[PDB]
């Protein structure tokens, strides 16, 4: 009976090595710790978010401190296209002379790392020009992290620790988060853009000792309150304006040209300030929707139980029974966590899908490796958030769901036909894999036997209609913003498409990624992607809806979320838990984003190298994906160190091979299972006891690690090997052809 772990008693009395491991993996499941009340649960959720916010701020201050200290922001900012950003310095005391010389790069006088995060472009756009501005930002974020470490400690003191009623005050939190956390913050950000970022992109230096005196507009503070709002967009930046200088600059601070800045190939800063200003007002308005304590507002609980639609008998919102859902969502933390992750998983996919097509930061479209890494980062982040959104759906069904409160509501109607949903995800998955693999390997066979004209090539004429419906005149659909005489193009009653000449100038220019040209090769991958999103939804939906149990074991709710099996009886129940559907869907999530990011990378690697006709003519069959993408672009990655030398890709060539090993060692935890290793550890335990001079002896008996743990240990290696291998590929295959 050890002290550790103190949160669970029955794991502290574990005599084996699984209690050190299970303590790590249970240490944050506060709702299952011994002697926990609901009141104490939230007060530890709350106080560990402060400890999390501080880590984000200490991480962010580490970005700033290291480019202030060891970066080349001053050198970079004078030529953001031809010099590489420095991440930090290298101190590996076991480099040879070949690695010092190779990694002494980008105008540095010491080994350094090339920043592929884009923070240089982000800071250059938001108005940071000196290293000292970066340093005081780093110091401020350290102290801002301090006031959240203190606040977290503060709200565990009994006199400051909030009560359960404060946490379950859903209407008051939504009102402030909409109005203040998002509304005021985006209003404040438009304040920075108007006061600092926009003026400093026109040359004038605005700082903390300067900003109180110089107004951002000549008509400041008076055109707003009179109502003469148009004064803020009188003369905008011209098309010959060059960034961070006064030549070509205007005076408009809130103007809505749309499209791209012709010199940075990014969105206009004045167009962003006007954006967050509009978003703020919409968000602040949205934050006055729910009544807090002023009996003017909405009550979410009553918006559920309402059954009267202007006197007409209805069953609830949208004529669907939502009664009891307020007390279901409000008391469930996993329902709330599932919704939050699902909404960050969309906001992070949406981040990736928009920041490549519509680059926000200056000169980021000309930094291909940064642009490529940022997409792959946020899509992989979004894939994990989507898996966790459906993980906590499965926890929600098991632990904090009851049929009594939710009797007859919209949530209980889903369980009534959970097999109709799963059977249909099964059909779509089967449909999309038979006719995408079958169409790829038909194209393989025809190209293999020379008859490349016998490929089945389906033009994606529906997405090409979208592009034509947004402005792309390339295809010739000639409708609806491709038709200059249409109702939508002109907006006949008002003609207020001030955004349209600038946008159509950008969408119809072929040198950007905004609405890329789409061909038959793009058709097939969007069905691989659709097949991917459907199977990994099928695995997760099956795991959430069968978390309560199915005919193979109808009592899964009693066994918890993560259990191995229910023995070999009834045929065998390996991987039966709802946890094993989250485990099984990480493979499909990684696979699917290994199709999204492979397709994003190869499509852009063909545009960037000018060989666009390589992707269009060879992405329709699977060998082209294998010869023209993987085999072709590995050449300079694997030659990062050869017998004849070593270059700046020697670390990417090493992590590429590192991730192959981390991937392969995953198969050990995934293929060979527990009882093999226990009979082998039982033998090594015999050898240690019987041998002389071995004076150590285990405090806790060595056992082969458990069933649900190896599935997690092997899933971590598969993931780390999936990310180190592709991270090294994507960085080295893009930052070797180019700068």
């Amino acid at each position: 009976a050890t002290k550790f772990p103190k949160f669970s008693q029955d794991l502290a009395n574990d005599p084996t090595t699984r209690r050190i491991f299970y303590a790590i993996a249970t240490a944050h499941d506060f709702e299952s710790h011994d002697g926990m009340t609901e009141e104490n649960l939230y007060q530890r959720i709350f106080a560990s978010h402060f400890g999390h916010l501080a880590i984000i701020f200490l991480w962010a201050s580490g970005i700033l401190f290291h480019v202030a200290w060891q970066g080349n922001f001053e050198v970079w900012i004078k030529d953001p296209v031809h010099v590489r950003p420095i991440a930090h310095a290298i101190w590996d005391a076991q480099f040879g002379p070949g690695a010092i010389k190779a990694f002494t790069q980008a105008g540095a006088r010491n080994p350094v790392d090339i920043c592929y995060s884009g923070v240089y472009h982000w800071w250059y756009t938001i108005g940071l020009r000196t290293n000292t501005e970066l340093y005081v930002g780093a110091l401020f974020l350290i102290l801002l992290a301090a006031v959240f470490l203190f606040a977290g400690w503060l709200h565990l003191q009994p006199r400051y620790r909030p009560n359960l009623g404060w946490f379950k005050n859903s209407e008051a939190r939504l009102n402030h988060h909409l109005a203040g956390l998002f509304g005021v913050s985006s209003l404040a950000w438009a304040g920075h853009l108007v006061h600092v970022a926009i003026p400093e992109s026109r040359g004038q230096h605005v700082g903390w000792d300067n900003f109180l005196s110089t107004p951002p507009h000549p008509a400041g503070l008076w055109a707003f309150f009179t109502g003469n709002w148009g004064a803020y967009a009188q003369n905008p930046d011209t098309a010959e304006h060059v960034f961070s200088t006064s030549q070509g600059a205007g005076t408009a601070i809130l103007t809505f040209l749309g499209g791209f800045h012709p010199q940075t190939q990014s969105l206009w800063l004045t167009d962003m300030a006007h954006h967050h200003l509009a978003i703020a007002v919409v968000l602040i308005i949205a934050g006055h929707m729910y009544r807090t304590n002023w009996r003017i507002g909405h009550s979410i609980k009553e918006m559920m139980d309402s059954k009267t639609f202007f006197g007409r008998k209805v069953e609830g919102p949208f004529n669907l029974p939502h009664q009891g859902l307020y007390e279901t969502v409000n008391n469930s933390l996993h329902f709330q966590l599932s919704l939050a992750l699902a909404c960050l998983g969309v906001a992070s996919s949406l981040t990736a899908q928009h920041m490549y097509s519509m680059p926000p930061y200056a000169f980021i479209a000309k930094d291909f490796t940064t642009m490529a890494a940022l997409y792959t980062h946020h899509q992989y982040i979004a894939g994990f958030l989507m898996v966790g959104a459906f993980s906590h759906a499965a926890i929600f069904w098991i632990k904090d769901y009851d049929p009594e409160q939710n009797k007859g509501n919209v949530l209980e109607r889903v369980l009534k036909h959970k097999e109709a949903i799963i059977a249909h995800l099964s059909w779509v998955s089967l449909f999309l894999g038979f006719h995408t693999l079958g169409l790829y390997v038909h194209n393989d066979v025809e190209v293999a036997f020379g008859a490349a004209d016998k490929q089945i090539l389906i033009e994606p004429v529906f997405a090409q209609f979208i592009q034509s419906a947004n402005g792309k005149i390339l295809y010739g659909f000639h409708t609806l913003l491709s038709n200059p005489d249409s109702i939508a193009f002109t907006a006949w009653p008002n003609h207020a498409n001030v955004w349209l000449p600038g946008w159509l100038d950008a969408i119809n220019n072929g040198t950007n990624s905004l609405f890329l040209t789409i061909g038959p090769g793009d058709f097939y991958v969007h069905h691989a992607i659709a097949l991917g999103l459907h199977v990994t939804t099928l695995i997760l939906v099956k795991g959430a809806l069968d978390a309560r149990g199915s005919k193979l074991m109808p009592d899964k709710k009693d066994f918890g979320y993560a259990f191995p099996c229910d023995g070999p009886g009834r045929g065998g129940t390996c991987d039966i838990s709802a946890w094993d559907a989250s485990y099984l869907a990480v493979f499909w999530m990684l696979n699917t984003l290994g199709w999204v990011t492979f397709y994003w990378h190869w499509k852009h690697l063909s545009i960037w190298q000018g060989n666009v006709a390589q992707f269009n003519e060879s992405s329709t069959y699977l060998m082209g994906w294998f010869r023209d993408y993987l085999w072709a672009n590995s050449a300079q990655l694997i030659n990062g160190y050869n017998p004849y030398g070593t270059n700046n890709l020697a670390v990417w060539a090493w992590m590429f091979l590192f991730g192959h090993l981390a991937w392969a060692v995953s198969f050990m935890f995934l293929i060979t299972w527990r009882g093999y290793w226990q009979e082998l550890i039982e033998t090594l335990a015999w050898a240690h006891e019987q041998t002389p001079l071995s004076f150590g002896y285990w405090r806790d008996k060595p056992v082969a690690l458990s069933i649900v743990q190896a599935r997690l240990v092997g899933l971590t290696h598969f993931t780390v090997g999936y990310i180190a291998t592709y991270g090294a590929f994507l960085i080295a295959s893009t930052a070797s052809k180019f700068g």
Partner: peptide
């Protein structure tokens, strides 16, 4: 029973779908 709320919300979404196809097939402007 005759479905009156499932219908007229399915036929409403087909309507929006058929309008989109109308511009698609170069029928209405």
């Amino acid at each position: 029973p005759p479905y009156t709320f499932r219908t007229a919300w399915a036929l409403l979404l087909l309507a929006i779908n058929f309008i989109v196809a109308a511009y698609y097939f170069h029928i209405i402007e």
